[PDB]
Structures are given as C-alpha cells and as structure tokens.
Design brief:
Entry title: Crystal structure of oligoendopeptidase-F from Enterococcus faecium
Strand order of the largest sheet of chain A: 1-2
Largest interface: A-B, 48 and 47 residues
Assembly: dimeric
PDB class: hydrolase
Chains A, B: Peptidase M3B, oligoendopeptidase F
Structural class of chain A: mainly alpha
CATH class of the largest domain in chain A: Mainly Alpha
Distance between the termini of chain A: 62 Å
Order of helices and strands of chain A: HHHHHHHHHEEHHHHHHHHHHHHHHHH
Oligomer: homodimer
CATH topology of the largest domain in chain A: Neurolysin, domain 3
Number of domains of chain A: 3
Keywords: Protein Structure Initiative, hydrolase
Largest sheet of chain A: 2 strands, antiparallel
Shape of chain A: globular
Radius of gyration of chain A: 26 Å
C-alpha cells in the first residue's frame, strides 16, 4: 500500500504529463499562456520530486530491502520521465527576451507568485541549454546518479565486517550500527580492534569505491563543462548564489589555523596519557561527564535573546537548547535552520562558563565546545578540501585511482592533525566510507554555518547595537535561496575571513583556559 | 603492442586533436575537402580506438594494478575527448544527400577505400542525431560504461574468495583463473567446495552487481530510445545488419528442443553414477598427426595446398580463412569435419564413444549454455524497458527458473545457481553471446552440405571464405539464419549423436 498509493500517484502523474504537449511552444502566446505553463510544470515536477525524495529516503533506511529497492527504482524512472517531458520549459522561457518576460508580469499580477522562480532562470541564461540538450541530460539522469546508488548498496547492504573480541571479552560482530559505540569505548584494545577491523574491509574494496566515487565526480565535471560553468564547484554553489570565495576563505582560514588543532591534539594525548595518539583514540571521552528542571537554566541562559524571543544530565541540556532554537526558527518558516540551533548552544555554553565555578564542570564544557568545533569546522573542512581536490584533479585529467586518492587523503589528514597524532595506515582509506562525497559540494556548509553561528552569538552576547534585531529578522526571513545575503543582513559577511577568525580566536582562548585548568588540578 | 608503444601513440594522438575543428563545416565544399576530412577523422578515431581497446585489455588482465588503472583511465579520457571532438562528422555527412555523397566518390577515386564505412553511415540516417546531441552523448561516453568498469574492478581486484583444500592436503586460493580446473576435478568434494565457496561471495554481493548490471542495461535502453530504435536489441543487431528474427529464431528453436539437453543430463547422471546430479558435477569428464592432413579430404583440391588434434584444425581453420563470428564458422566447420572423419574411420568403440561425447559437450556449451545467457540478456533489457525493477531478488529468481527450464529433471535445483547472472562478464557486452550459438549452428549446416556432397556446397563455402553482412553472406553460402531449419538439423545431429552414444554404452 506504500507501493499501492505509489501506484495511484504514478498513474496520475503519468496521465497529467500528457498535457505537457499542450503547453510546449505556447510561452510566446501571452502572459496567460505563460502563467498556465509555469503552473503546469511546477505542479507536475514538484509532485514527482516529493515521491522521489520519499522513496530515496526509504531506500537509504534499508537498502537491502527488495520492496524498497523496487519502490526507489520505480520512482527514479518516473522522475526522469517527468524531468525529460518538462525539459523544454526553461529553454522556451529563455527564447523570450528579458523584457518580454517582465512585460508579462505587468499584464498578469498573478505571475508575481513565481517571479523569484522566473528570476533564477533569467539569471542562469548562460547555463541553460537547448531543448534537445536538456532532454538528453534529463533523460540520462539515472545513469549519472547510478554510482551513488551502487555505493549506498555496497556500503549498507553487502559489506560485512569482521568479528572482534568485545568489551566483556565476548565475540562482537562489527557493523555500521555498533562501530561508533566501539570507537568510544574506554577499553583501548576494543577501540583499536574495531578501527582495524572496519578499515580492513574498506582497504579490500578501495578500488570499487574509487570507481563509484570517481564516476560521480566525473559526472559533476561533465555537467559543469557542458553548462559553461568554469568548474564543478562554481556549478554547485551558483544555484544557491554562493560565491566561490566563501569556500576559498573557509579552506584558507582553516589551513592558516591548523596549529590550533595540533595543539588540541597534544592536549588530548596528555589527557589520555598514551605513548602515542592514534585516530582510534580521538572519539573516546577525555574528561568523562561532570557532576550535574533543566528548563529554568535553559530560559535563563537564553535571556540575551530578549523579550520577543523568550515568549515565542549536562549533554541533554545542550539538546534542549538546541531544539528550542530549531523550534523558534520553525515558527517563522537546512544550513540556515542549523544556525538558529548552534547559536543557542553557543549562548548556553557562554552562560555556563560565566556561572559555573567547579573546575570539573568548567573543564567539561570547555572540552565539549572544543570537541564540537573539531568535528564541525576542522573535520568537515578537511572533507571540503578533499572534495574540491578530487574535482580539480579529475578535471585536469589526473586519474583518481585508489592509490592516488589514499596517498592524497593520508597526506591531508597528517597536515590537519599534525605530529601529535600517529599516521595510521588505515586512515588513508577513510575517503571511501564518507557518504557526503556523493552529494555535490555539501559538507563545507557545516563549517561556514558553525562559524556564522559563532559570530551571531558573539554579537548578541555583547549587546552589539543592532545585533538582536538583526538576528530576529534573520529568523523572520526563513529558508532562502540567498543564504549569504541573509547572513550579510544579519551582520556576518561570509566572503570575508573575520567571522572565521573570530571563531578561531574563541577556540584558542577556551583551549588556553582548559590547559590552565588541567595544570591547576 | 606494448605499453611503451601505447605511450607513443597516446602522445601523438593528443597532438593531432587540435586539427579537428579545422575540418568541421567543410564537407560540402567538394570531393577533396570531403576526402581530407574523412582521412583525418577516421585516422584519429580509429587509432585512438586501438589504444583504448589495448588499455581496456591490460586493465581487465590486472585490474588491481595501479599502472593499468591509470593507463586505462588516461585512455578512456582521450577516447571520449576524441569521440566528442569528431562527433560533428556523421551529422554533417548526413546534411548532404546520398547522391551528393556518392557523386564525390565518382569524382575522387581515393575515396573508394572508405565506401563501406560511408555506406554504414548512409544506412544509419534514422539513428544519427544532431551535432549538439552527438557531442553530448560522446562526451558522456565514460559515464555510460562506468558500471562495466566498476564490475571489472569488483570482480577482478576486490572480491576475495574462500580458500579450499584441493586433492591433497593442499590449500588452494580460489580465483577466476583456477575455478575452472577445480570444477573439472574428479574429486567430488573439491568440486562442491569450490562451487559453494565461489557462490557464497556472489550471494553476498548480489545487490551491488544488480546495481552495476542494471545500470548497464539502462544505458542500452536509453541509447536505443534516443536513437529511434524499437529496442536495445535492434540497436545492437543493426550494426551488422542482423534482423532480430535471427535472435528470436535461435531462442525459440533452442527452447523447443530442450528435451535433448535433459536427456544428455540424464546420461551424465548415469555415467557419473551419482544418486543426485548437481551443477557442480556438470564439468568433470564423463569418459576416459597427419590425421588433420587427411580429415579435410572432402574439402576439395583448392583447400589442401585427441584434443591437441582438434585445436590444430581449428587454428588451421581461421588460418586458411586468412589466405570474428565469421572466422569462427570456418574453424568450427573444420572440427565438424574430423568429428565426422573419426566417427566414420575409428574402429575401437571407446574412441568412437569419446568423440561422440566430445561433440555433444561442445554443443551443450556453445549452443545451450550461450543461448540461455542470450535469453536472459534479452529478458533483462525487455523487463527494464517495461519499467520492472531489476532488483537482485527478481534477477536471481528469474535466473533460477531459467536454469531449471534448461537443465530439466535430472539436475538438482542448487540454490547457489540463482546468483550466476552476477559473475558473467558477457552481460556487460551488448547482445554478444547469441553469436556463439548461431555461428555454431551455421558451421554445422555447412559441414553437412560439404560432407554430404551437395550440388554447389563446396563451391559456396570456398566462395564465402574468399564483412558487415554476415546474414546475407551465410545465405549465399546456402544457410539461411532467419529460418529455423539450420538450427533444427543441428539439433538432429545432436540427437542422432546422443542416440549413438547411449546405444554404444549398451
């Protein structure tokens, strides 16, 4: 019945689709015909996107499930069929002149509902192709995306990992579900064994993954080229009006501040007291929970948010505050929504550090912050740097073999972590297990967003004259195709280094405070 | 061709590219301009194809080796670059009328060498697209066969197979190059262990292979549609002007005569003396030089001037034919010829029984097994076209039923065999295997015409061995592959020979 409701929707979308013929070639007949065409394709296209996204999700949740595999395949065919059938649309819009288009808007106010949609198309004149070409590209979409599916299935359904000896001395089956727990164990032997077990399998299949990921990367480059973008990156970022400079700034500022990570790794080595720090030691607790109605403390910390905002264990406290943030942002309407959450966490962290006196408590929150910072800025940026490296290398024609990918990834890892972390041979193959590399320049947004959140909390916590008002107006804006102008209006210019440099300064000061704390105790 | 030669050609080809744009748009300016353009695009395309094919080979031979992954990568990039840069050529030729093109040929005899190739382009007007479309399709070429590349690396480099104890206390590492002889072992424990070891791995990776193979099938179907073909099968078969009727015929007549394979399996079961016959028992043998200079005695005056034996006549087959499907007709025909000569000449019945079985065994592999693959191959394209998802469960269930249909009652339904579809490289070709069975049958009908000394038989054969139209070439030689007859009397030959084997065994 998930596939019987699907059956009804497929049939309905398929039949409605026949009316496509009627709209094609009419755009120049009048504002009315133009409106009707836009109404038709958006309606058909979006109803199909919904079904697609849904089936894809279900597939990802159990990729070994026949019924889900089948549903996702049927939904992919429908999507390409619809995309193909509607591919004449933007080329035909573009056969009109800019001034004919806005002339239609004067004649038919109702079109105002779509102006922002028609605007993108007009602004993208150089990257939209002819009906013939768009038809080929749309119809081939399944082929372009296939290697992501192969990856998903191999990674989640077919790979099986070895057995290890577990925490109580019992046989434990390694798997995606259990691995993270095992990497956090206070039992170092179990950590080392889980890490080596998992990586023995990625190493075995490194050629297959290079092939799947390589193909994915090739498709981005090919599409960028035939659409007249100067690169795959410009292509992905443009459709969100993100200038390439936000990406360069992120990678450059993070590279210039790697010594801060290096230092944080020395501290972790000291805390663990191990002879040598390895990748399999970075996710286990170094401090281990501080001795602590979390609602009162929540509302108290968020006070700097002000009157308007208010009316509208220690880890769970952060969660509560994190959710309130998403909850208030939801009230007005993903990276843009993540900011409202992280900003709140930032405000609770600062509040704790201004009120907590117990050294164990202070240490816990200092390290909790540095830790989140390690994962969301340094690690995601590492990934963003590798993602770009793969595209630029492939575009220059250098083969992305597993050997080259692994040696490259190994080097980048060592650059990021520094001499305090041993160069584990296993980690050269990590590139192959990261799902995000099969998106399209997605991961860097974790790091820019985190930095933005940091800049926004710092403006609020110091009552910068128009800080509150501007943050609230960013809440009232809602999800937008223009994240950097939204941010710019809220006082964070993401094209410039300062906002990341401010976060870095905070990482350093809190790092310095944690060290001094460790020395006293 | 060596790696060093490859690098030399690779380098030169990179350079010649800059001269493609210089010929674009000149085809209507006269016979010379036309000739100059064709000399250039055909040189650069073909030579780039030659080194791509080579790199593709070294890669399939040593898929885990970085040297060859890189070589093949740099060859695929070049080949797609060359294909794209030269993609304007066919559409521009076709902007001329056929009579303008052939007029060029009358005006410029140095074009005559290219007639056959232009014929093909001229015959393909309905399936060649615009410059913009051909450019897009050629540039995406690497994306379209990526999944074949993924198959090869998974299958050749990454999959690790179990270890087994061979016919000593000997620990043998299972691999592709060594599986076959394990299956031929007289030791039943080794056979079964190799069989299950191998399929334990394909079972685990059935989803990944379904995804690479299904992606491959989709590419075919998509290409077929945009080029205005009625199916992927028609699209592939049209390259050698083979009507689909030769494929349907092959499958129908083979299906109709499956009882013959069943009987053969029945007999294998008795000769092996096993209470239950399994897939892993099917390859172990059931039984225990100027002869070649004589065997070809009914081949005519012109022609002239136990396993080792057959191979010398096979290779002497494609050797005489030089004084691919086609060359294999002439080689298999020669084998048909001594099978008859031994059969007529050999007095001792154990030798008589061997060649009988040798023939039927070759038959079982080249016609029945290859046709089974041909049928499944068509089934996959056909289902995918109708929109039915090719999940591994469906592929495996369908492959299971198809395997049972073919082998019949005497053969146990081994659950492992459901996953065989995933290890067969030819499914990543493009409607290729069916030629084995048609070629075999055609070679059989020619041999009969020859051995039976029919009206003009000899003449025709040695007029055949004296192209791109194999069907008509064969028809001229007196065997019509659009009809059932030629396969039906190959089946009679299989049936008669079986009858003789059994009747001998008693």
């Amino acid at each position: 019945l998930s596939d019987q409701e699907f059956d009804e929707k497929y049939l309905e979308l398929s039949e409605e689709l026949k009316q496509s013929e009627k709209h094609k070639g009419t755009l120049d007949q009048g504002a009315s015909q133009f409106l009707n065409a836009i109404e038709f394709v958006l309606r058909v296209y979006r109803q199909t996107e919904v079904i697609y996204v849904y089936a894809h999700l279900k597939n990802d949740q159990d990729t070994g499930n026949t019924d889900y595999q089948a549903l996702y395949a049927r939904a992919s065919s429908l999507f390409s069929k619809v995309s193909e059938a509607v591919s004449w649309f933007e080329p035909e819009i573009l056969q009109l002149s800019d001034d004919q288009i806005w002339q239609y808007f004067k004649e038919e106010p109702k079109l105002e509902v779509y102006r922002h949609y028609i605007q993108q198309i007009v602004d993208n004149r150089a990257h939209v192709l002819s009906a013939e070409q768009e038809s080929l590209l749309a119809g081939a979409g399944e082929i372009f995306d296939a290697s992501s599916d192969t990856f998903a299935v191999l990674n989640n359904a077919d790979l099986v990992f070895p057995t290890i000896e577990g925490e109580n001395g019992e046989i434990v089956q390694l798997s995606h579900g259990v691995y993270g727990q095992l990497l956090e164990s206070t039992d170092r032997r179990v950590r080392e064994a889980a890490f080596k077990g998992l990586y023995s399998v990625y190493e075995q299949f490194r050629n297959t993954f290079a092939s799947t990921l390589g193909t994915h990367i090739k498709g981005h480059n090919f599409k960028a080229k035939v659409r007249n973008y100067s690169s795959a990156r410009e292509a992905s970022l443009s459709n969100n009006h993100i200038p390439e400079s936000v990406y360069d700034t992120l990678v450059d500022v993070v590279n210039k501040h790697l010594p801060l990570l290096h230092r944080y790794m020395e501290l972790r080595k000291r805390l663990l007291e191990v002879e040598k720090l390895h990748m399999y030691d970075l996710y286990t607790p170094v401090l281990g929970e501080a001795p602590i109605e979390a609602k009162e403390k929540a509302l108290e910390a968020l006070k700097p948010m002000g009157e308007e905002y208010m009316a509208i264990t220690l880890d769970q406290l952060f969660t509560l505050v994190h959710e309130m943030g998403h909850s208030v942002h939801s009230y007005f309407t993903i990276f843009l929504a993540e900011i409202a959450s992280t900003t709140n966490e930032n405000i609770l962290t600062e509040y704790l550090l201004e009120t907590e006196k117990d050294p164990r408590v202070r240490a816990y929150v200092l390290n909790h912050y540095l830790d989140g910072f390690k994962g969301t800025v340094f690690r995601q940026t590492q990934f963003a740097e590798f993602e770009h490296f793969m595209h630029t290398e492939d575009e220059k024609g250098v083969p992305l073999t597993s050997e080259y990918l692994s040696d490259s990834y190994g080097k980048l890892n060592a650059k990021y972590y520094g001499p305090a972390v041993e160069e584990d041979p296993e980690i050269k193959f990590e590139w192959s297990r990261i799902p995000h590399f099969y998106y399209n320049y997605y991961v860097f947004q974790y790091s820019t967003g985190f930095s933005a959140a940091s800049a926004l909390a710092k403006k609020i916590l110091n009552q910068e004259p128009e800080a509150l008002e501007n943050y609230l107006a960013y809440l009232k804006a809602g999800n937008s195709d223009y994240p950097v102008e939204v941010m710019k209006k809220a006082g964070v210019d993401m094209t410039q280094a300062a906002y990341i440099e401010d976060a870095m300064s905070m990482f350093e000061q809190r790092l310095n405070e944690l060290e001094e704390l460790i020395d006293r105790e």
